[PDB]
Design a protein around this ligand. Structure first.
Ligand SMILES: [Mn+2]
Ligand SMILES: [Mn+2]
Lengths: 581, 281, 221, 274, 6, 293
């Protein structure tokens, strides 16, 4: 009975931290092996009176108590564990008080209402009266959780305790109390929130510190989601209006970030009458981070309105703000704006997308910054779905040559991936005239991903344009660059063999495809033999039995005892897969 | 033992109106195709035989007595072999940092490791060096002058057996052969006792740390009983220099033979038949 | 105060110790560790660092009054020991710099007595090796400072040095092979060099070093 | 599902379940490591007065659980020697000696084993076998640890542990002479292994005083016919027969015992004897 | 670097 | 046995490339096979041309994936990493696990060197120990990875002409035969040849000097020229300092700094680079940006 306490006290004092962790992570084993009333009687006062100097053990014991409250004997006997769990609140670390408050959240969740009405209310009212701020943070959390199981008089007592604690001067308990206001009204009725919660909410939003106003405005968006359409205009709406244009930029940054749930909560008439002019005030100010957030939110603000008025407000107010935001001297604002600009295209009608968004599209194409270019070129697929390929192709005619040679390979990657649609729409004659050279230079780039994308692009072209065109215009250049001393150029030619052989045909597979593969399997570079083994492995099934048995089998038995072990293994598994022997 | 025309004919494809792929050449290109040396061992062994025959004629004494029933060994002069030893030390290591004939402590081997690696390279490249040591061996005051060479080669072997991770010593042929040949030559030169000098026949079947401990035992013995030019008595009836291991006071190395016997007592499983060679005289 | 380092840049200062490093690199490390140990003292906010090498003028003053700390570091780390052992001219050049600014400021009031409150504290440290003193004509046995009177007013004081400056000498005698015997003397010996009588006259002491531990004791002292 | 030492310290039936658990988590010899490391805590008082650990009930129940764990492995010294260090094994065998009703400081000269209780006789035989094997394996060379600098505290407590190892090995020698007397009195069956280690001792002091080699030979010849009486009954007998073959091959070269066809005829033997 | 992130 | 381990290790590669951590027994087997494959490797491993040499990674796994998207996939292009891929990064265990699994899968295609961060003390103090506790749970996988770092080769040689190592030169090293004679089978000391091998760095000096790091030395153009002349080398490749442009040709076209961790410690904003020696020793630089997140 006392020997567990003795080994606990001689084990908690050492050098390392792993041993106490292994002890208290298995303290539930000690409790279940020893008994129930024993650990109610002596072990709980033992863990109260001891004070440790390390923080992670407090986390582990808190979560162990949270998992242990079931092993205590059920919800009826958990009154023994409440003085220790409230004794854990007098700590100085954030993670351990978070673990403590979530443990007490679980305790409040699992437990039958009558002895919450009897016992937890004095405990939360007494730790609410604690002088330390951590006790008040735990108090406002516990008052946020203890609503639905108490009676009306006990309710009104905890409401007036909440007004007693929420009015104090020190800021961190006001932050915690504002967060618990945001979590608090999610369960209340309409009359109590419309009578006393919202005027003191306005009072707490009327103070000076920025962060209490931050937590106040997301508490405002929660209560706007909660309150019906009939009452929010008269009381909390001027509060959020006067909080919209405050002196600090943090509050307008947050109400920009929270603007979408605000406009979803209030309803379209309030958005048109009040939120739109404040939003023109939002993107047209001097701070630039709020401007980037304003672009990030003008995307999902324009997608979420009513149609018959969204068209008018975008043709009347939004587009001049877009034109002003494009010419902004800050760069990150332009990058974010170009990230979220062509999402307006499926929203907006066709000819208006042309006559407004395409000049700014071509403007954002030629910007010297890379992030704006990579964002707009990634969004070119989304604008490509709603705008027909013909006028988009004619728009990208003088802009396709500068974007195939720019520094960043993301833009080149997306241009290569998008190019088959452009070539298929735009015809074969133009590609044979002055557009094949771009793909030819793409096949010999430095970046591997660019070359692999160009090889898949070759697959798309041989699929979309036909057989004899690829015979006349693609294969001889592939062989001429197969005759290149550099090794990775030979790698790209092997990739061309593989990927163009996916469609290809049957006649060219033995008279201009196979012999070049055969004749260069004796290159001293082991990677050449490695990938010619891979190419033979893949190209096996498309070939017929005569060529597969005439010269493929002797070259594969030639390459299966060479010095490098990797090419030997892939030659062996190529012979295994192709069933050559 | 030990341009532009062909450049411009093959610059198609990657050039044009676009820049070339590379940024430059690191050096002059590939470092040759590397040369493969080829010899035949019969000519090597018989030119070595001719040279050692010439040396053993030159380093012999006058003689010319024709006394007795022959069957005997003519003396090799201890002064000619001293000259051969001096010029061999000159050829291999011209340095004078450790030119003292008394061996320094073991930790001092960690200082001049560059010199030890250089003597190791010299013994590895040319086998004739080892052969010359045997010529220095059969004139017992001579190999004492090569104490620097033996010390450097021993320290290189110590380094190799410290860095060796193989379970068996036959995975490195040359270092095993060099260790056994070295201790055999120092056993020829009356530097080690016959009890301790007969250890190399177990070296082929030990662990690298085990042969390392044996060579440290050798190093400690040469600490305790140095390879001085003196301590050889010129016994005159048949005039030769003899080192008798009775009167130095150590005799057979007590701790050294103890460590060597512990080495045998570990690997009883394989060093069973050869345990009879290390019996006390 | 004013900390001046006279680093010997003769070719004899290019010998290699048992540490696998040259003597000049050991001198640079001595300067660096002197910097660290002086910066440990919470009284060294104002300390002007100067460097003079064994090179003929005007390439003699590496760092002076109008330079800063970064240029002192850059010129310290970029020293090449490719000269002769000309100690007298370098010592005269260092004293000429220091006494030159001294007589510029009027720190020493001639005729009005000697005021030891007017003070410009200065310690100069000559790091050398103790080789033979060499000129372009031959070896010089005994150290003589030149007497050319370049600074106006040098005749009003008999000695080229002054009473506000002190000379110390770090003579590096690191052997090529490490000594088997370990030095256990608490005190640092004096050297039998040609710079020792001069630093005894000027009111300093010549530290003689034979080991890196000895260098640490010398530099702490 | 790992375990800890005080899990078994609080309840004995947990250790009983662990001893019966077919595919365990950390094996019982590392459990011996953990319990005997916990029992090795110095008894520092309130004034930091370091003394021997106290004889409370917790220590005694820890030792009896440890000896029950050791009994689960049938007191087989092979894996128990290979997996546990020297001073910890000294403490374990001292505990096994004192639990067998032996007062400390007793001279080990006679203890007639027929008159002894069977458990006491087997315990003193086991302790003496540990002594003789420990000194023999201390004569063995060891792979030197690679010189990577550890932390200072672990290096210091290793230094203290190997220092106590040196202490226990010297006192091991000066009782080991009398222990050799106890072994040679202990011949008067599965004790052949016992005799085996006796002959191994005669190789440790064989380099000097070569006459003990002759003593050594009959001991190993003894083992051979007892191996002939064993067959495949290697329950407590764990003799490596490669070692026996190598040792007897070493033992043949001190004397000619005739029977050249029966003895070795490899040319190394006749060139050596000639 | 226009990212205060406060 | 070879086929099942090969396909399991390929599935390990595929699971690593999508940024998923492995299990403790899988790391056990990977580390054991890594020990077996790294025992038979010299201190100066000759890597034949062609090879794409990459520099410090320092536990930036998505940047490593981008690096594989630039220089080529690991099956097809040879790689040589000059260590220091374990600390100062959020995803550290995935990076080292990917390198070791690629080494034991492709033994002639991936060459891995040793950095100074790949030691017990430095991993304990600069983050790998903490990452070990937060992901896998106990400190035992750190023990296998420290032993694995212990067996790693120090330097590498490309066509007998390019010397690749992590740090810099040494006052105690004069020939490459002394590199091959060192006992590599030990944790990196505070003083000695190998600590200088993994800790030294070039600077525009005239000789040796105490590095401002607590260990190692610093060397100038004269020392590098002497080392290149006396050993038949022409280039010394290394990866030890942060570089904006990703490559530096210091000591007059003799010492090459190649840093391959863009945006080091996620706050420096450097554009990393790697070197791609072709089959003609006929090089090019691949210079890249950090990955999108
Ligand atoms: Mn790193
Ligand atoms: Mn590094």
């Amino acid at each position: 009975s006392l020997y567990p306490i003795a080994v606990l006290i001689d084990e908690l004092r050492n050098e390392d931290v792993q041993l106490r962790l292994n002890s208290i992570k298995k303290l539930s084993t000690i409790a279940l092996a020893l008994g129930v009333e024993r650990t109610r009687s002596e072990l709980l006062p033992f863990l109260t009176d001891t004070i440790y100097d390390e923080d992670e053990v407090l986390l582990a014991l808190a979560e162990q108590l949270g998992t242990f409250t079931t092993l205590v004997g059920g919800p009826e006997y958990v009154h023994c564990l409440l003085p220790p769990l409230e004794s854990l609140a007098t700590v100085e670390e954030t993670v351990v008080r978070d673990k403590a408050v979530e443990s007490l959240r679980a305790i409040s969740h699992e437990h039958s209402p009558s002895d919450l009405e009897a016992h937890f209310v004095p405990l939360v009212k007494r730790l609410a009266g604690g002088d330390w701020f951590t006790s008040r943070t735990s108090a406002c959390g516990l008052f946020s959780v203890c609503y639905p199981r108490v009676s009306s008089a006990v309710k009104a007592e905890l409401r007036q305790y909440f007004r007693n604690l929420c009015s104090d001067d020190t800021p961190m308990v006001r932050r915690a109390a504002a967060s618990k206001l945001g979590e608090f009204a999610k369960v209340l009725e309409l009359d109590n929130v419309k009578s006393e919660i919202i005027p003191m909410f306005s009072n707490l939003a009327s103070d000076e510190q920025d962060s209490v106003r931050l937590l106040a405005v997301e508490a405002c968006v929660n209560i706007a989601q909660l309150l019906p359409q009939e009452d929010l205009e008269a009381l909390v709406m001027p509060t959020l209006r006067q909080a919209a244009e405050d002196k600090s930029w943090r509050v307008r940054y947050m109400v920009a970030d929270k603007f979408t749930e605000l406009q979803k909560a209030v309803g379209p008439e309030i958005t048109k009458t009040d939120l739109v002019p404040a939003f023109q005030n939002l993107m047209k100010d001097c701070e630039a981070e709020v401007r980037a957030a304003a672009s990030h939110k003008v995307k999902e603000f324009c997608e979420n309105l009513s149609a018959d008025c969204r068209e008018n407000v975008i043709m009347s107010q939004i587009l001049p703000c877009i034109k002003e935001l494009v010419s902004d001297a800050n760069q990150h604002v332009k990058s974010a704006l170009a990230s979220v600009i062509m999402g307006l295209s499926p929203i907006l009608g066709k000819d208006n997308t042309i006559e407004h968004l395409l000049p700014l599209f071509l403007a954002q194409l030629k910007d010297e910054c890379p992030e704006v270019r990579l964002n707009i070129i990634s969004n070119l697929d989304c604008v490509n779905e709603v705008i027909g390929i013909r006028q988009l192709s004619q728009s990208l005619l003088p802009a396709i040559v500068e974007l195939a040679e720019d520094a960043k390979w993301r833009v080149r990657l997306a241009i290569i991936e998008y190019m088959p649609l452009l070539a298929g729409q735009l015809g074969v004659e133009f590609f044979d005239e002055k557009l094949n050279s771009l793909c030819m230079a793409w096949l010999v780039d430095h970046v591997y991903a660019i070359r692999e994308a160009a090889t898949s692009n070759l697959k798309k072209l041989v699929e979309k344009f036909g057989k004899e065109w690829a015979h006349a215009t693609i294969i001889p250049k592939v062989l001429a660059m197969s005759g290149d001393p550099n090794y990775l150029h030979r790698m790209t030619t092997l990739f061309c063999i593989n990927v163009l052989s996916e469609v290809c045909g049957q006649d060219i597979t033995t008279k201009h495809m196979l012999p070049t593969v055969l004749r260069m399997a004796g290159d001293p570079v082991a990677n050449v033999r490695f990938n010619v083994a891979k190419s033979l492995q893949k190209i096996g099934p498309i070939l017929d039995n005569s060529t597969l048995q005439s010269e493929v089998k002797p070259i594969l038995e030639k390459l299966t005892q060479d010095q490098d072990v990797d090419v030997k293994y892939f030659a062996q598994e190529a012979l295994t897969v192709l069933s050559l022997a | 033992g030990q341009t532009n025309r062909r450049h411009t004919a093959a610059v198609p494809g990657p050039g044009g109106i676009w820049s070339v792929f590379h940024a430059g050449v690191i050096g002059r290109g590939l470092k040759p195709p590397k040369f493969v040396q080829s010899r035949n061992q019969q000519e090597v062994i018989y030119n070595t035989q001719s040279l050692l025959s010439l040396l053993v004629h030159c380093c012999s004494a006058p003689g010319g007595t024709e006394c007795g029933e022959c069957w005997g060994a003519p003396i090799l002069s201890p002064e000619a072999a001293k000259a051969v030893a001096v010029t061999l030390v000159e050829s291999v290591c011209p340095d004078a940092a450790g030119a003292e004939l008394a061996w320094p402590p073991e930790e001092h081997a960690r200082a001049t490791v560059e010199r030890d690696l250089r003597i190791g390279r010299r013994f590895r490249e040319q086998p004739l060096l080892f052969e010359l040591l045997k010529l220095v061996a059969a004139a017992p005051p001579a190999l004492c002058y090569c104490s620097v060479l033996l010390r450097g080669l021993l320290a290189a072997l110590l380094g190799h057996w410290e860095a060796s991770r193989h379970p068996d010593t036959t995975h490195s042929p040359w270092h095993l052969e060099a260790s056994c040949t070295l201790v055999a030559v120092m056993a020829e030169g009356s530097l080690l006792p016959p009890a301790l000098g007969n250890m190399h026949e177990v070296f082929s079947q030990l662990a690298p740390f085990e042969v390392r401990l044996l060579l440290l035992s050798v190093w400690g013995f040469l600490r305790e009983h140095g390879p001085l030019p003196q301590k050889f008595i010129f016994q005159s009836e048949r005039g030769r220099f003899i080192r008798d291991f009775s009167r130095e006071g150590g005799g057979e190395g007590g701790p050294h033979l103890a460590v060597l016997h512990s080495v045998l007592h570990r690997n009883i499983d394989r060093l069973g038949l050869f345990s009879g060679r290390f019996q006390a005289p | 105060p004013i900390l001046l380092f006279l680093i010997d840049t003769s070719a004899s200062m290019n010998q290699r110790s048992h540490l696998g490093t040259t003597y000049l690199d050991t001198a640079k490390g001595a300067v660096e560790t002197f910097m660290k140990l002086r910066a440990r003292d919470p009284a060294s906010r104002g300390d002007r660092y100067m460097l003079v090498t064994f090179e003929e003028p005007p390439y003699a003053i590496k760092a002076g009054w109008k330079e800063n700390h970064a240029t002192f570091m850059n010129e310290l780390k970029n020293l090449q020991a490719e000269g002769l052992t000309t100690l007298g001219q370098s010592l005269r050049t260092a004293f000429d710099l220091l006494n030159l600014n001294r007589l510029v400021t009027g720190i020493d009031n001639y005729g009005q007595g000697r005021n030891p409150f007017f003070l410009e504290p200065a310690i100069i440290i000559t790091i050398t090796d103790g080789s033979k003193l060499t000129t372009t004509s031959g070896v010089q046995d005994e150290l003589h400072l030149p007497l050319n009177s370049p600074l106006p007013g040098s005749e009003l004081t008999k000695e080229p040095f002054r009473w506000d400056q002190r000379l110390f000498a770090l003579v590096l005698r690191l052997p090529g092979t490490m000594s088997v015997e370990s030095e256990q003397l608490t005190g640092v010996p004096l050297d039998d060099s040609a710079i020792t009588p001069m630093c005894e006259v000027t009111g300093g002491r010549s530290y003689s070093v034979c080991s890196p531990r000895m260098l640490n004791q010398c530099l702490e002292s | 599902p790992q375990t800890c030492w005080f899990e078994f310290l609080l309840e004995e039936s947990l250790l009983e379940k662990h001893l019966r658990k077919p595919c365990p988590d950390p094996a019982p010899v590392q459990l011996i490591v953990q319990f005997l490391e916990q029992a090795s805590k110095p008894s520092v008082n309130e004034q930091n007065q370091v003394q021997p650990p106290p004889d409370n009930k917790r220590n005694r129940i820890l030792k009896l659980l440890a000896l029950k764990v050791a009994a689960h492995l049938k007191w087989d010294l092979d894996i128990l020697e290979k997996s546990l260090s020297v001073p910890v094994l000294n403490m374990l065998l001292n505990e096994l000696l004192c639990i067998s009703k032996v007062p400390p400081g007793t001279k080990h000269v006679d203890m007639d084993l027929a008159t002894l209780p069977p458990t006491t006789a087997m315990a003193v035989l086991l302790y003496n076998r540990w002594a003789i094997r420990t000194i023999v394996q201390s004569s063995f060379p060891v792979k030197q640890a690679k010189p990577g600098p550890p932390q200072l505290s672990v290096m210091n407590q290793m230094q203290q542990e190997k220092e106590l190892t040196e202490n226990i090995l010297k006192v091991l020698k000066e009782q080991a002479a009398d222990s050799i007397l106890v072994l040679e009195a202990a011949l008067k069956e599965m004790q052949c292994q016992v005799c085996y280690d006796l002959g191994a001792a005669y190789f440790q002091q064989g380099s000097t005083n070569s006459a003990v080699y002759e003593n050594a030979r009959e001991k190993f010849f003894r083992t051979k016919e007892l191996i002939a009486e064993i067959g495949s009954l290697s329950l407590h007998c764990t003799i490596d027969e490669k070692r026996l073959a190598g040792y007897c091959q070493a033992c043949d070269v001190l004397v000619p015992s005739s029977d050249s066809t029966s003895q070795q005829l490899t040319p190394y033997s006749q060139v050596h004897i000639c | 670097y226009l990212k205060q992130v406060p | 046995d070879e086929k099942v381990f090969t396909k399991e290790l390929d599935q390990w590669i595929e699971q690593l490339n999508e940024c998923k951590q492995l299990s403790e027994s899988q790391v056990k087997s990977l580390c054991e096979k890594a020990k077996e494959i790294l025992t038979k490797e010299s201190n100066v491993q000759e890597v034949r041309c062609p090879v794409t040499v990459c520099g410090d990674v320092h536990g930036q796994f998505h940047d490593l994936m981008e690096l594989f998207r630039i220089g080529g996939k690991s099956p097809d292009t040879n790689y040589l990493f000059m260590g220091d891929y374990v600390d100062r990064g959020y995803y550290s265990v995935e990076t080292v696990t990917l390198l070791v699994a690629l080494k034991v899968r492709y033994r002639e295609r991936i060459t891995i060197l040793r950095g100074n961060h790949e030691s017990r003390q430095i991993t304990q103090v600069y983050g790998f120990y903490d990452e070990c506790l937060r992901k896998y749970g106990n400190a035992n996988v750190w023990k296998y990875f420290t032993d694995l770092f212990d067996y790693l080769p120090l330097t590498a040689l490309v066509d007998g002409q390019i010397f690749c190592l992590h740090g810099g030169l040494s006052p105690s090293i004069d020939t490459l035969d002394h590199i091959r004679a060192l006992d590599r089978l030990q944790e990196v000391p505070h003083e000695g040849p190998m600590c200088d091998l993994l800790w030294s760095d070039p600077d525009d000096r005239g000789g040796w000097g105490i590095s401002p790091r607590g260990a190692g030395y610093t060397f100038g153009q004269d020392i590098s020229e002497t080392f290149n002349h006396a050993n038949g080398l022409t280039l010394v490749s290394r990866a030890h300092q942060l570089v904006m442009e990703g490559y530096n040709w210091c000591h007059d076209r003799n010492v090459v700094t190649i840093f391959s961790a863009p945006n080091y410690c996620y706050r420096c904003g450097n554009q990393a680079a790697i070197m791609e020696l072709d089959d003609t020793l006929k090089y090019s630089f691949l210079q890249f940006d950090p990955a999108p997140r």
